[PDB]
Design a protein around this ligand. Sequence first.
Ligand SMILES: C[C@H](CON=C1c2ccccc2-c2ccccc21)C(=O)NS(C)(=O)=O
Ligand SMILES: C[C@H](CON=C1c2ccccc2-c2ccccc21)C(=O)NS(C)(=O)=O
Lengths: 116, 116, 116, 116
Amino acid sequence: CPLMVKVLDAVRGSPAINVAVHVFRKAADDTWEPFASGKTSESGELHGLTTEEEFVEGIYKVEIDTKSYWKALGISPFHEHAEVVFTANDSGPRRYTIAALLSPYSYSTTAVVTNP
Amino acid sequence: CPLMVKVLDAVRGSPAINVAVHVFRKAADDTWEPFASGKTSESGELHGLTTEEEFVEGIYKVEIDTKSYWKALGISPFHEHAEVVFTANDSGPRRYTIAALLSPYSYSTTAVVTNP
Amino acid sequence: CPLMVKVLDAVRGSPAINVAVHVFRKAADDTWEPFASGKTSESGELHGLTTEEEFVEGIYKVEIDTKSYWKALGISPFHEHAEVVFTANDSGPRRYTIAALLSPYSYSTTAVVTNP
Amino acid sequence: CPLMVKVLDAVRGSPAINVAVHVFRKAADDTWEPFASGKTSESGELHGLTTEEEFVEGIYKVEIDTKSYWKALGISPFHEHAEVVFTANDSGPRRYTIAALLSPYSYSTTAVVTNP
Ligand SMILES: C[C@H](CON=C1c2ccccc2-c2ccccc21)C(=O)NS(C)(=O)=O
Ligand SMILES: C[C@H](CON=C1c2ccccc2-c2ccccc21)C(=O)NS(C)(=O)=O
């Protein structure tokens, strides 16, 4: 796991379960190419998006589909998604955990980056 | 004037209105002595807590009574209150705004320290 | 007037001054069309981005150029920018303040939606 | 582990290592009695504070000594500590993770509460 996504619900104090996550990588023509996707587990975590081989240098966007998550709980939230955009691996491979804490009208995101 | 408190509600996307706020100063015997208090306004703000003359260097605690705010909304909260504890410094900027962003199981707090 | 942006620096406890901010609207072909932009003031605020007349319902993106802000400070940051993506609604309150709290490896964003 | 504390550094994007944490429990006479203490590990986590037997109903305060953490990194931060105050186990035993995200002039805290 060079890339993990962890999502928490700040209203319930719980993992945010079954939240859709789409990862994109900026292509040579400046467009966002689909890179990987998945859903968070019971623990609010999404493992296995990629491999150290596949996860090369680049600019990556992690789009967490928070609006669908709130709507299913009966809540009409402000944001369409939480986006996280960053350059990865530009000094060598690292392991990235992208953490998102969700409320209906706010979210935070935090990266924890470790040298493998 | 030298100390303002501002409180926002991350669930409703609004000022947190009618939130009790208690300020204490630490006494020489290490106890907390009541110093000032009030309730946030319609804009989620509490002004007028103290004066330049009274707000001398020392250790202060700002308690924000968050549990009663969520209970009034019928939302089950985790914390009894949010506490913000700091040392007032004369060398720095002259105005302290303590901002607090509230969710039922999370809060953040940020000090913005400026020259007025 | 209907859309304000406010940015704070959690490392220095200050407004984040001179931060570029770009607003886009989503077009019918699903692309992002430039809509408005500016730089935060000394108070970390950006006013005057749009008018009531122009700010019709639709999907908007607010990009806050955080990486250039940290680089100017000599602090190595994680994100390229902070994006805030939302649907403007006429049924709700009439003013949207997008607040962003910045740290090098984390940010939060909160929408405060009020009647002016 | 009915009680875990996890601390992250938002400036470095890393676990906050060797941070002192003191837990107190409100006594019958309304005073704060020492309950447990420890330091965060390499992973920014502090396990083993208590047991399900020892961790009875009550009002608990988790004091995270963030000022000492920043000072050792050369930073003079705003807060003396991050305090987290909550009622525990009042509907039966639960498992509590208290997470704190630290910046020099801001912090957030979030509880994740699971029914064992
Ligand atoms: C515009 C403001 C919300 O944002 N302002 C913030 C502010 C002003 C001074 C210091 C810290 C903060 C802050 C921190 C986090 C989120 C918003 C704000 C707001 O709530 N508007 S109102 C109707 O006057 O209450
Ligand atoms: C990479 C991962 C970080 O996990 N991040 C969490 C986080 C970030 C922001 C807010 C809440 C949480 C959280 C809560 C529970 C468990 C993990 C995390 C982690 O394991 N950190 S480390 C290397 O052991 O120090």
